[PDB]
Amino acid sequence: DVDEMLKQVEILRRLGAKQIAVRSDDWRILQEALKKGGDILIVDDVDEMLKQVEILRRLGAKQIAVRSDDWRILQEALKKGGDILIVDATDVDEMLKQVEILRRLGAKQIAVRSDDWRILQEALKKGGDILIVDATDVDEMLKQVEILRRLGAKQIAVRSDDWRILQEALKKGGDILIVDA
Ligand SMILES: [Cl-]
């Protein structure tokens, strides 16, 4: 969706978003995001993921993110030049373990994704850098963003396939807006 992603990135920039992330499986879509000024490129198969990280690295992308529920894959991504490691969280204790492991591998930017703000709060307490609210309902999203902010979160991302939710997240003060491509 080079056209439809370009649209959302441009509108979000006009609405005042300072950090826009684009997720896609096609490195050329991410390349188009990079040339458009997208801030974070999210690489959405392990060999294919590693090849995309190398391509984006050599294109000059400064913030390459990789998502996995397997810390071993995130470790491989870090060694090949990934910047932001996104821990896909569904159990609090497994999430806390992965954050510990990746920090000790030298990861300087660890993100945790969940639709449960309580998991995100546990990641915040543990030192997770970016909390990704996985949003389905606009009012639920708004309450989670406020809770995490008041609990001290300083980088809150919102991901949604609903454009209406991304717009409202930005209005509410969400720090990073994640566009699907
Ligand atoms: Cl994500």
In the chain, domain spans:
2-180
What is the experimental method? X-ray
Ligand 1 midpoint to CA 67 (Å): 7
109: CB partners within 8 A, 6+ apart: 63, 83, 84, 85, 129, 130
Q: Are 181 and 163 in contact (CB under 8 A)?
A: no
Ligand 1 midpoint to CA 179 (Å): 9
Ligand 1 midpoint to CA 159 (Å): 6
Torsion region of 37: left, alpha or beta (phi above 0 gives left; psi -120 to 50 gives alpha): left
Ligand 1 midpoint to CA 137 (Å): 17
Closest CA to 181 of 45, 31, 77, 15: 31
Distance between CA 60 and CA 171 in Å, rounded? 30
Closest CA to 173 of 34, 16, 26: 16
Runs of H (alpha helix) within 15-162: 27-36, 46-58, 71-79, 92-104, 117-126, 138-150
Q: Are 107 and 78 in contact (CB under 8 A)?
A: yes
Report residue 64 CA to chain centroid gap: 10
Quote the DSSP letter at residue 153: -
Residue 173 backbone phi and psi in degrees, to 5: 105, 10
CA angle 73, 1, 84 (to 5 degrees): 30
Q: Are 99 and 127 in contact (CB under 8 A)?
A: yes
Torsion region of 168: left, alpha or beta (phi above 0 gives left; psi -120 to 50 gives alpha): alpha
Tell me the two tokens of residue 124: 């915040």
Q: Are 87 and 69 in contact (CB under 8 A)?
A: yes
How many other CB atoms sit within 10 Å of the CB of residue 155? 17
Give the three-class secondary structure for 21.
strand
Tell me the two tokens of residue 129: 């850098």
Q: Which fold has domain 2-180?
A: TIM Barrel (3.20.20)
Ligand 1 midpoint to CA 70 (Å): 14
Q: Are 99 and 123 in contact (CB under 8 A)?
A: yes
User: What sign has the CA pseudo-torsion 108, 69, 49, 112?
Assistant: negative
> Using N-to-C axis directions, what is the helix angle for 71-79 and 46-58, rounded to 10°?
30
Quote the DSSP letter at residue 131: E
In the chain, breaks (C-N over 2.5 A) are found after: 44
Ligand 1 midpoint to CA 142 (Å): 18
Ligand 1 midpoint to CA 104 (Å): 22
Ligand 1 midpoint to CA 68 (Å): 9
Strands 156-159 and 176-180 come out as parallel
Closest CA to 70 of 41, 49, 39, 53: 49
H or E element that contains 87:
strand 84-88
Tell me the two tokens of residue 165: 């939710």
Ligand 1 midpoint to CA 87 (Å): 9
Task: Give the CA dihedral 63, 117, 6, 109, nearest 10 degrees.
Answer: 0
Torsion region of 16: left, alpha or beta (phi above 0 gives left; psi -120 to 50 gives alpha): left
Residue 131 backbone phi and psi in degrees, to 5: -105, 120
Q: Are 132 and 157 in contact (CB under 8 A)?
A: yes
Resolution for this model in angstroms, one decimal place? 1.6
Ligand 1 midpoint to CA 58 (Å): 23
Distance set, CA 34 to CA 23, 123, 146, 151 (Å): 11, 29, 30, 33
Tell me the two tokens of residue 79: 């060694």
